[PDB]
Each structure stands twice: as C-alpha cells, then as structure tokens.
Structure 1
Amino acid sequence: RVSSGRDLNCVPEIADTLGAVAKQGFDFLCMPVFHPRFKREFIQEPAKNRPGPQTRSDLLLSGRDWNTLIVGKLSPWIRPDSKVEKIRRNSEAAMLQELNFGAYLGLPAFLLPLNQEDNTNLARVLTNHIHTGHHSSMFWMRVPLVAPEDLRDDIIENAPTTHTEEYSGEEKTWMWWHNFRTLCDYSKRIAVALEIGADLPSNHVIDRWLGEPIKAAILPTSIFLTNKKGFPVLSKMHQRLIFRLLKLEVQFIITGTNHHSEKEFCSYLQYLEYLSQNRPPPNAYELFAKGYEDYLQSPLQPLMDNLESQTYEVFEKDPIKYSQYQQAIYKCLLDRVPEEEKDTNVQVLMVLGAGRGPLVNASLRAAKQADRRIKLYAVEKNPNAVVTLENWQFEEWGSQVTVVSSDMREWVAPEKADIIVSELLGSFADNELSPECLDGAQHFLKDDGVSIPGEYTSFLAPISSSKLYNEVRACREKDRDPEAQFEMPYVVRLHNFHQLSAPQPCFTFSHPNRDPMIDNNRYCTLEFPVEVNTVLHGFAGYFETVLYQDITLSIRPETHSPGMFSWFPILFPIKQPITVREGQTICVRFWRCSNSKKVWYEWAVTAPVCSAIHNPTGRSYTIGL
C-alpha cells in the first residue's frame, strides 16, 4: 500500500494526462499550474499588458480532482533570490500569483525548489503567503540528498571535481532546508520533498534528514538499475533508504522519462509495491503503537486523578508485564518458604495499588505454581476500581483476599507483609510517584520484607526531531504561560526522530528504602557524546526495573522487554533548539524536586550552550502528592 505520484513538467491536455497517470496507477500528479516556459512580466511595458488567459481554466477539473489529485509546481524561471533586481521583483510577483492560484484551486500540496544556498527572499515571499489568509495547503520543499554541483560528471578539464572528504559540505543541502524553515519560523505547512540521486551520499548525510518533516520522496527514473529480464530495479543501498522512508509513511514521487521503454511506466510503480509487500510485517509492538506515532499525550497522574475503566482495561492487555510479575512473586515465595514449610507458612502479600486486580490474580497464580500458602490484601485508593475489586472478591477470590479501600500512606494495616507488590511505575519510572507511595507504606512491611519492584532506574537520551519540536510548539493554550508547553514532559511513541547519544541512567530508587533520612529529591549531570552534526530538540526518557532478582522489565531500547507495550517513551522538550556539531558534548542537568504537596522535574542544558532552567518551582508542571 504505497501512495505515489507522477511528476510531470509537460501537460498538453490536462484530462488526457490525468487519465493516463491514473491508468498507470498513480494516486496523484505533480504538474505546472502555469506553462513552465511562459515567463511573465509585471512592471515593464509592453510585455506587462500581455493578453490573457494567463493559464488553463479551473473548469477543466472538478473541485474534488483539484483538492486530491493535483500537486502544483512553481515555474522554474521564478528566481526570488536572483542577483538581478528586475528578476527578483518580477519573480516575487510571479511567485505570489502562482501560490494564490493554487490556493484558489484548493490544491493539497505545492512544490518549490531549494536548488541553491540562498533562499531568503523565497522564504520572505512564501511566509508572506502563509500569513495572507488561514489555510491547510502544504508546501513541499524539493530538496536533493546531493546538490547537483556535488554530483556533476568530472569532465571540466580546468575546473575538476573535489575528491577530498568534506564532512560538512556533503551535508550542504540539509543546511539549505534548515535555514529555509528557520526563516519561515517552523511553519507546520512547510515539509520536505526529498530527491534521491543515482549515487547515494555517506550515511551521515542521509541520517542528517532524520527527525525532519519528510512528506515526499522523489525517485528519478535514472536511479533505477535494469534487471536480467529488463525490469527497472534498485541497488541494495537504495532499497535500505526506501524501507526507512516506508516507515515514515512518505508519498513516493516518480520523476523523469521512461528509460526502460520496453516496459510501461507502471513497472517503476510495481517495484515499489513489491518492496512495500516484502518488508517485515508489523510485530506485536509495532502493530499496537500504530496510530500513536509522534502523538503527544499528557502523562497520567494516577495518584491525583482516579483512572477511567477503559484505562485499566488497556493496562491489563499486556501479558509480558504480568507474566514477569507472576515469575517475580513465584521466585520470592520459594526463596522465603522452604518445601518442608510448604503447608505451615502462609505468606502475607500486599498489592499496593491493586486497580482492577491483575497483580492480585498474578499473586494467586504465582502461589499455585510455587505450591505455597498466601494471604492477600488488595489496597486501592480509586473507589471506582474498588467496585471491580469487591465484585471480584465476592464472586471469585473469597476470604483469601482482603480488599482495602484506602490511600497506602494512610492505611493502618492489621499485620505486616512478607511481600508488598505494586505497579506504580510511569514511563520515566518514578513519574507517577512510586517512591513517595512506597515510602508511606514501608512501615507495614516486615523487617526482612520484599518489595516487587525492588529497584527502578530511569534513563535519558538527547534527540533531534523538528517534527516533535513543532508538535510541542503547537500545544499553546490560552490563559497560561505562552511558553508552558515546553516546560512539561509528554508520553509519546517517538517515531520521526534521531537519537543523538546512547541513553544514560538518570534517577535510581530502591525499595525498601533502608536510608535513615529518606530523600527522594535528586540532582544529576549527564554528558552525552555526539558524533554527528544536529539540532537538539529534547530528551527521550526511558526506564528499567528489577521486580525480583533477574526478573526485569525495560523500555530502554537497548534492553526493551520483548512484546511489552505498556509504557511509551517520555519527552522532555527544550524551549529553544540547540545546534550541536560533530564531536561536541551535550551536557544536561536534571533535578527531581518536591515539597509536601507536589513533585516535579527541572532541567537545563549547560553544553555546548546553555538553555534556561525548564519548569522553575514546578511553574508549568507538577505531580500531585
């Protein structure tokens, strides 16, 4: 299922050309809206008074066709950054005319090239068009992986091609894009149409496009190799990039004439459909996460707020998570009570934050496996979840389980526990306040008692994602700090991003907390080596937890628990993007702060440059105690 388009710069009859590309199987068509050679004058007479029409009529297609099948293209003679003033003034007038016409037609996308370093005036004129009205139309900046100057044949005897490695120079077209979208102030309407050449650049040059809003990939017919039967095909390296772009769900565009003339134009299409059908299928996690890609969510605050029914339902449909919890209990029971005591000793187990009872059931299953005697207390503060627990206790569990409707920090337990079990962990481990909860409860755990989980560690990693930076920027709410959306974390399935350095551990908590003076506050400095040129947009947060001994759960990509889809990564953004060069170190500082009523995080980048301290005093984000 590849959505594809045909790029044409020659359309004699619009209807016949449209029907032609349709028969060939193309979903849309990129075409000129004014004749590409029809240079127009706006200042100088007599050419200014040229009789009309200036182009073909809108009546030639239905409104629907214009909205869905046509991608406009700027005329190649429009040069807003030309050194000739007369050309600069005229191209500004022509650029506006063409863009206004495409907006008049209701075109879904419109293409403009970035075929040189300086596009300041092209940016001034486009930005101006965006701020003239309020529309949904996209602008696809046609930009190549390799600039033409860097891919030209070595055939100029007195002007030869440089055979030296220029790490930064090979990434010149990315800088063209970067500068153009910076000038246009990261408009959500401006995206990349990435043109792939016959020869691929170094992987660093390709990786430089990670986290960028790529909406289209342009494949010229020329890059296609010929197979033994005469069919157009691609090199193993070109396939790698195609597969990468398929994940980003870009629209593929075929540009150029048919060079495999024995076959039809649908042969270029058939190859892409074949490549699309022959990729690894969506695995349990990738199938689950589908739809949530780069979708920002507020992290849950299950202590302050009572969770909804369908939320516990989602938590529950994660077999791996509770399989591991079962195994951690099963292991702890054998270690605590020997086979000789298998009928004398009854273990007091306390599920702290029982929800709808998945850990109460997992404890029962662990006992009917370890063949040991257990007493259960199912503590839950959410009275709505307690209704589920008490209807469970009556109809199944019986007197074996004591349902407690209380806050675990307030509860006066009749006896002590051998094991306190809980699932109070967030995507950043301690973000749902697992430390504070378990500290208020550890008074009713036996002097030799076990906590499942016994330990948890959060991890941070610097990331680049212009898509997620803009996604956050758009989270501006009235009646609050206009910059507040940057001073809060988000639970998101990070998809279009680039991990700038390996995750490093951030905050660690251990239960029981045997410390004489318990302090859950933290200050931590991380130094991240970056071996690429990039733009820092924020930090991806993850976690790892020891439930019991070797039985663990992890969302850190290097050690991610297989098939476990409960927690998505967390994101700590920064207000202003930070330029990072190859070889530099990203230094971040994170604090975990609290008072008697609330807990929060503060953060700051101190290298290569400083950021402001994010979330001072919990002004934008706090977690209620």
Structure 2
Amino acid sequence: RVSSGRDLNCVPEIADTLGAVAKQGFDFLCMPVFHPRFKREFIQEPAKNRPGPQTRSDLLLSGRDWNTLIVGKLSPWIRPDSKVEKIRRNSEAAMLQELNFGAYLGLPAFLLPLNQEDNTNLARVLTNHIHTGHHSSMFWMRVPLVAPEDLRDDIIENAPTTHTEEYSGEEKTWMWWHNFRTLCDYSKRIAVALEIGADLPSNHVIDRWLGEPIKAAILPTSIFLTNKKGFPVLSKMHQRLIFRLLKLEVQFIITGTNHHSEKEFCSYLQYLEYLSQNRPPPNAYELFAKGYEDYLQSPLQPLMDNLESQTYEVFEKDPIKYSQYQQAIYKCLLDRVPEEEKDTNVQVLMVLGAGRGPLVNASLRAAKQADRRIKLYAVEKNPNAVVTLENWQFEEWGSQVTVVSSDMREWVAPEKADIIVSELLGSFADNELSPECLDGAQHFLKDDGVSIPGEYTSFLAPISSSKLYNEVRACREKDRDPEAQFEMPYVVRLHNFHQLSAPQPCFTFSHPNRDPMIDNNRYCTLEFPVEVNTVLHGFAGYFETVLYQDITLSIRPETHSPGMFSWFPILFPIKQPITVREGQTICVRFWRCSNSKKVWYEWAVTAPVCSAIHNPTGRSYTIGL
C-alpha cells in the first residue's frame, strides 16, 4: 500500500481534525503549529508584549501522536529573505521559534517552502538550527516542478507570458533546490517535497529530480481529472510520474479542498491505492535486491580474507549463474571430444576457487549431459570451505573429484588441464583480481586448453545522486584520512540516481594470456556526451563476461542477465561534485595499477573541469595479492 498524508492550512480543533483525516484513510497530517495568520512581533513595543499563549498546547496530543502523525508547516508570512529589514528580523526570530517548537514536540518532519530564487537567509537560519541541540527531525523543502510565475494564466494584457521556450528557464525550480541544499552543505536532514502541477513540465526535468532525495510528492486535488463515473483520476502522463515515484518509495501528500462534492474525500486516496496495487509485481531480481537500495558495501579482500559460510549460501541460490556455467562446460566438452572419441577421451577439468562445490556439481551435470568423461580437480584456498568440499567428496563425488586445499597461484599440479573453470569476478569484473590469479595458474593449462571464462570487460557510466554522495560522505571514520571514503569503490544497489550517459567499456582481460610479457596494468580515457544540466557525483561500474562462445553473464543494464542477483553495480565516487551543462562532454580517466603486493584503481575527471586524481598510490584502497 501507499503511505500518505493530508496537507491542511486550517485546523479549528486539532483532535477532531486528526480524527476526520484518520477515518478518511490518511497515515499522517501536515498542519500549522502556530496559526497561519498570527503574525508575531519580537522587537518593537507594544505588539512585542502581546499576552500569550503564542499557540496551542502540546497536551492536546499524546507524545506518540506528535512523533508519528504530525508534520509541521512553517508560517506563510515568515519571509527571511524579504527586502525589508524589519520583516527579515522578525521572520528569522519567528522561524527559529516555529522550528524550536517542532523540535520541542518531537515532530518527525517539518515543511518549508522554496517559492522564489533567493533563499540565502532561509538556508542560513535552517543551517543554524540544524547545528543547535539534538534532534532527528527531517526538513521537507516544498518545491514545485513548475514555478508559479511560469504557470500563471496568460491574462495580463500588458505582461504577456513569453511563449518562446527556455531550456534553462524551465529548470529554474531545480536550481532553487540545488542552491539551497548547497548552502546547507548537503545536510542529510534536508529532503524534497516535490509539488506536482496540472501541466507537467517538459520531460527533461523529471529525469534529474529522481536522482535527488525526494521524501514526498504533493498532489493538489485540482490536478485530478474526473471520469465517466464522476470519480477523481489522473492523466496518462501523471500516472507515469506516479509510477516512477512509487518505484522510488516516496510519501504522497494530498493538498487543497474537495473538487468532487458528489463523493467522500478518501476517493482521491482510493485512486492512489488503485495505481499502487496495479504496478508490475517484484521480478526475481527485485525480490532478492529488496532490502539493499543505496546501501554502500565497502571493498572486499578476496585473497587476504575468507568468505563466511552464509555468504556462499546466499549466492549459491543464483537462478542463472550456475546453469550458465553448466551450459558453457557442456558446449566446450562437445567441441573438444568428437562422438567416436566419447569413451577413449577423458577430459581433465580444474575448478579454480571451488567454494562449497556448486561449479564442481555443475561440471558433473555438464558431462552427464554431453555424455562425455571427465576428471575433476577442486582447488580452493579457503580452508573452511575445503571442509565442505572434502565432506562432499567423501559422501558423494568419490574419486572422480580431487579436492586440493591451496592457492591456485601456489599449487603444483600433478597434470595439465583441458579446461580451467573459475568464478573470480567482482562487480567491476577484475576487482577481485581474477587476472592475477588465472595468470599464476595458467602454467598448468594445456597448450590448447580452454579457460572458462574466456574474457571479461568492465563498463563505466557517469551518474548524478545527492543521496549517494551523502552516503559516501557519511563513511568518514576516525583514525584515517578525512576524505579516504571518497577514494574507494563501493558495491551498491544503485537506486536513487540519474545515469548521465550510456555505459562504455573500460578494461578488458583475456584468458589464457599468451602475451609475451604479461602486464595487467591499464590506462583508459572515456568521453561521455551528456545532454542535461546536472551534477556529477561519481561513476557506476558494471561488467560483462564471455564464459564460452555465446554463453555470457552480464550486469550491464542493457544486456543484464535475467534474475542474476549475484553482483550489484560498483560506485566510484568523486571528492567534489562537478557541474555539467547540457551539451557538455564528461571526460574521465581510469588507471589499473599494481605492485607485487597489491592492485588498485586510480581515477580523475578531466572535462568539463578537472578533479583531483583519486586514490594515488593506493593510499585509500588496494586489493592485497
């Protein structure tokens, strides 16, 4: 179901009002905490000394209701950015007072408008309040898709509505938000309450906003059409935006009065509930990915650390990775041993990094499908998993499988392999050091031996997202470089973000590698044509791999394998957001670096402005060899 609230600017009796809106089906209520028309004076007498009470009492509701059911609204007369000095001063004092009152009450959220370009003083006062005392309250900035000035009826004879289109002008609203939250240093407490108008703006806007921290969408009753049965509904295009907002998981806010007198109020809400339970259901991927949205996971050490039993357990459930491997081994066997040879030829297969055995079993199932004969080695450096393997070997596999407990770079093979099978890949393909491992193992592959996988390629795309930029910022730790968190990639189910350009290939590796001198280091320059105005916060990483011939795996969104939850995208942040304009090209540069002990990435943006080179020397992140 949808979670939703009623916006009201009139509340005669707080207890009755809360009850009415509760009955109608709303989860919460947005209402003034002082009377909207009750202008207060703070400086000059006599109005300064107006006898109180200044507003109604906290006792009117239970603490629990204040914390869960009420959203506060700033008074419409509070104008911290007025040109009149006395109004600015009173508005400052009043703003403090109303915010302090909401903090006193323990309100979960509080709405403030951005309804003009200059909000410098509003931002300053809010920032000061955020840095005073201790409270967890959210601030919702009420901002419209379309500025009021650009929605006005064309009805002023001598001030026409300038019908010639402005690409930039129609984005003024986002720039209001952007300046505001910049002044406030991306405080995680300042989110967006996006107001939808009757006329949706042009498409280009909507795309960006969806990378921003939208906590609520405000729907005025006046934007609702009315159908055959006289019920409130929405235009096809409004349905689209609603569906996007649902996928995002915002709260919906109904504002304004009932414009369909022939029905109850809850009819608007009934329509939202309608659209909600009318979305496509969670696909196989989205069922497993369900709790992980925008959750940052710090870099794994594939060699220096050992995976936990429950880690193997969860991934062993992948509906496609293993059957894809089975197929690749199936095809390879057929191609390597012709029909007349189906009993004379026993192929030697080595699973390199066997974990708890699923690729050993997949191997066996592939042979009992191609009707060919195989001898299996199962090599694994995680001695704890070696426990699982060796119990499997004794209870089931028998002598067909030889479990080896060591590093594949170290093992002295008793004989050469026909095929090495391995799944050593990270979200960025080579960031679990698959190259280095298979390079050190290849000496025991036969001169015509096949490696599954045969190759892999990494991909990058620039992205915009305040939400993720903040998540990273929040990864600052004591006892290390105060900016180290920006100099490492995170595995993350990217959710609240805007992808600024189509993915492009970054690094590629082939196995086996019959390079005279092998060098896994890399340097790559990418040029990303951008066609909106935005702020670059980092680069999503993806990969693709060829297991064998046409048998592949992918997390590149365009060619993503269906149901494959095993790898989320990776994120390379940048220390400082960079402004990009419609038509500009983003140029990034990535290096793969190494020494005998570790491998790392370094990166830099060089257009439209330069960033600092990130992670020089592996100072903030490396992967140990």
Structure 2-normalised TM-score? 1.00
Q: What is the CA deviation profile of residues 51-91 of structure 1, one whole-angstrom value per residue up to 9, with x for unaligned ones? A: 00000000000000000000000000000000000000000
Matches of 1:481 and 1:211, distance apart in 2: 28
Moved more, 291-300 or 535-544: 291-300
What is the deviation of 1:134?
A: 2.5
Matches of 1:577 and 1:237, distance apart in 2: 32
Q: What is the CA deviation profile of residues 519-572 of structure 1, one whole-angstrom value per residue up to 9, with x for unaligned ones? A: 000000000000110100000000000000000000000000111110000000
Matches of 2:168 and 2:195, distance apart in 1: 19
Matches of 1:476 and 1:116, distance apart in 2: 34
| RMSD (Å), alpha carbons | 0.5
- Gapped runs of 5+ residues in structure 2? none
Contact 1:455–1:509 (CA under 8 A) maintained in structure 2: yes
Matched, 1:322 2:342: no
Q: What is the CA deviation profile of residues 413-460 of structure 1, one whole-angstrom value per residue up to 9, with x for unaligned ones? A: 000000000000010000000000000000000000000000000000
Matches of 1:380 and 1:323, distance apart in 2: 21
State the secondary structure of the residue aligned to 2:326. Answer: helix
Matches of 1:25 and 1:66, distance apart in 2: 18
Q: What is the CA deviation profile of residues 197-248 of structure 1, one whole-angstrom value per residue up to 9, with x for unaligned ones? A: 0100001121130210000000000000000100000000000000000011
State the secondary structure of the residue aligned to 1:532. Answer: coil
Contact 1:522–1:593 (CA under 8 A) maintained in structure 2: yes
Alignment match, 2:441: 441
Matches of 2:412 and 2:161, distance apart in 1: 80
State the secondary structure of the residue aligned to 2:320. Answer: helix
Matches of 1:162 and 1:590, distance apart in 2: 46
Matches of 2:303 and 2:104, distance apart in 1: 52
Alignment match, 2:195: 195
Matches of 1:29 and 1:6, distance apart in 2: 5
Alignment match, 2:88: 88
Alignment match, 2:574: 574
What is the deviation of 1:297?
A: 0.5
State the secondary structure of the residue aligned to 2:431. Answer: helix
State the secondary structure of the residue aligned to 1:430. Answer: coil
Aligned residues: 625
Contact 1:142–1:195 (CA under 8 A) maintained in structure 2: yes
What is the deviation of 1:573?
A: 0.2
Matches of 1:91 and 1:277, distance apart in 2: 44
What is the deviation of 1:299?
A: 3.2
Alignment match, 1:11: 11
Alignment match, 2:611: 611
Matches of 1:541 and 1:314, distance apart in 2: 22
Matches of 1:162 and 1:245, distance apart in 2: 31
Q: What is the CA deviation profile of residues 328-355 of structure 1, one whole-angstrom value per residue up to 9, with x for unaligned ones? A: 0000000000010000000000000000
Matched, 1:108 2:108: yes
Contact 1:192–1:216 (CA under 8 A) maintained in structure 2: yes
Matches of 2:597 and 2:287, distance apart in 1: 39
State the secondary structure of the residue aligned to 1:208. Answer: helix
State the secondary structure of the residue aligned to 1:211. Answer: coil
What is the deviation of 1:136?
A: 0.8
Contact 1:171–1:208 (CA under 8 A) maintained in structure 2: no
State the secondary structure of the residue aligned to 1:432. Answer: coil
Contact 1:211–1:496 (CA under 8 A) maintained in structure 2: yes
Q: What is the CA deviation profile of residues 165-201 of structure 1, one whole-angstrom value per residue up to 9, with x for unaligned ones? A: 1001000010000000000000000000000001000
What is the deviation of 1:406?
A: 0.7
Alignment match, 1:207: 207
Matches of 2:21 and 2:153, distance apart in 1: 32
Contact 1:107–1:137 (CA under 8 A) maintained in structure 2: yes
Contact 1:28–1:70 (CA under 8 A) maintained in structure 2: yes
Q: What is the CA deviation profile of residues 475-511 of structure 1, one whole-angstrom value per residue up to 9, with x for unaligned ones? A: 0010000000000000000000000000000000000
Matches of 1:287 and 1:52, distance apart in 2: 55
What is the deviation of 1:471?
A: 0.5
Alignment match, 1:345: 345
State the secondary structure of the residue aligned to 2:553. Answer: strand
- What does residue range 83-232 of structure 1 map to in structure 2 within 5 Å? 83-232=83-232
Matches of 2:470 and 2:616, distance apart in 1: 23
Contact 2:9–2:31 (CA under 8 A) maintained in structure 1: yes
Q: Which runs of 4+ in 1 moved over 3 A?
A: none
Matches of 1:273 and 1:293, distance apart in 2: 23
What is the deviation of 1:135?
A: 1.6
Matches of 1:477 and 1:462, distance apart in 2: 26
Matches of 1:488 and 1:130, distance apart in 2: 29
Matches of 2:211 and 2:187, distance apart in 1: 15
What is the deviation of 1:319?
A: 2.3
State the secondary structure of the residue aligned to 2:300. Answer: coil
Q: What is the CA deviation profile of residues 25-69 of structure 1, one whole-angstrom value per residue up to 9, with x for unaligned ones? A: 000000000000000000010000000000000000000000000
Contact 1:24–1:266 (CA under 8 A) maintained in structure 2: yes
Alignment match, 2:394: 394
Q: What is the CA deviation profile of residues 243-273 of structure 1, one whole-angstrom value per residue up to 9, with x for unaligned ones? A: 0000110000000000001101100000000
Q: What is the CA deviation profile of residues 380-434 of structure 1, one whole-angstrom value per residue up to 9, with x for unaligned ones? A: 0000000000000000000000000011011000000000000000100000000
What is the deviation of 1:595?
A: 0.3
Q: What is the CA deviation profile of residues 113-146 of structure 1, one whole-angstrom value per residue up to 9, with x for unaligned ones? A: 0000000000000000000012210000000000
Contact 1:492–1:568 (CA under 8 A) maintained in structure 2: yes
State the secondary structure of the residue aligned to 1:102. Answer: helix
State the secondary structure of the residue aligned to 1:426. Answer: coil
Contact 2:217–2:250 (CA under 8 A) maintained in structure 1: yes
Give the % identical residues.
100
Contact 2:321–2:564 (CA under 8 A) maintained in structure 1: yes
State the secondary structure of the residue aligned to 1:282. Answer: coil
Matches of 1:471 and 1:125, distance apart in 2: 24
What is the deviation of 1:464?
A: 0.3
Contact 2:299–2:488 (CA under 8 A) maintained in structure 1: no
